[PDB]
A = this chain, B = another copy of it.
Amino acid sequence: VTLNTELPGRTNAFRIAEVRPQVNGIILKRLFKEGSDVKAGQQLYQIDPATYEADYQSAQANLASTQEQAQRYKLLVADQAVSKQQYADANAAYLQSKAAVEQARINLRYTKVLSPISGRIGRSAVTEGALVTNGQANAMATVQQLDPIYVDVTQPSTALLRLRRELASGQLERAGDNAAKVSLKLEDGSQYPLEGRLEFSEVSVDEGTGSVTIRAVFPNPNNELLPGMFVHAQLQE
């Protein structure tokens, strides 16, 4: 007849990432709506930059001053007008200031806490006015990418190598390199409109069984699909 392998498996986020502060300070602003969608590099919080701005302004000012003096003493020591010691001191101060600009520049950059990935942000563990710390145990927020979404399918090792063969023999239709065109039956019984992809590289092998988990990727442009849903994937042979 028609050859049908329906496959049990769970939805999973494509990518998950935490949002953490990397400088100490007060949360001046949140900038995002809880539950909403966010883009990689999107600013999610503003940490109070006043002290960071001023450390940076000051580090630049020390560099300028100190750099000019070492230029000046470079010439002076040339005409034996100063001793090596005074030039040494003048250069030491300069090298030190040059190095100090970097950390101040870095800290200032960290006052804008950016989304590490594009996706769906949850609740904020933190409140405007609250002090955060670099290295603090809890994340301020979590972003989950959902637009491509994963469907984790486990199977016996024979079953998988069976399927793999069917793709090489063309018995089975390709959806790209090392992948099969695949369809999705939801939790109830209805169909997914969009159609996916079953990649045949194993992601894990169970210790007790020889059981293998592979993944499917489906488009999900409206979050019809969310993590945790128990679905069934369809193959045509």
Contacts from A to B (Cβ < 8 Å) = 15-20, 22, 24, 26, 28, 34-36, 48, 50-51, 53-54, 57-58, 61-62, 64-65, 68-69, 72, 80, 83-85, 88, 91-92, 95-96, 98-100, 102-103, 106, 116-117, 120, 122-123, 125-131, 135, 137-139, 157-158, 160-162, 164, 186-188, 199, 201-207, 209-210, 212, 215, 223-224, 226-230
Given A96-B62, A207-B228: A126 and B20 interface contact (C-beta under 8 Å):
no
In the complex, what's the smallest C-beta–C-beta distance from A119 to chain B, in angstroms? Answer: 11
Residues of B within 8 A of A61 (CB): 95-96, 98-99
Q: B99 to A116, Cβ gap below 8 A?
A: no
Copies of this protein in the complex? 3
Known: A22-B26, A58-B102. 12 other contacts (CB 8 A): A15-B128, A17-B128, A24-B135, A54-B99, A61-B95, A61-B98, A62-B96, A65-B96, A80-B129, A84-B127, A123-B203, A158-B187
Q: B158 to A128, Cβ gap below 8 A?
A: no
In the complex, what's the smallest C-beta–C-beta distance from A31 to chain B, in angstroms? Answer: 13
Given A161-B224, A207-B228: A116 and B135 interface contact (C-beta under 8 Å):
no
Residues of B within 8 A of A91 (CB): 65
Given A129-B18, A158-B187: A72 and B96 interface contact (C-beta under 8 Å):
no
Q: Which of B24, B58, B98, B210 contacts A228 (CB 8 A)?
A: B210
Q: A17 to B138, Cβ gap below 8 A?
A: no
Residues of B within 8 A of A201 (CB): 35-36, 223
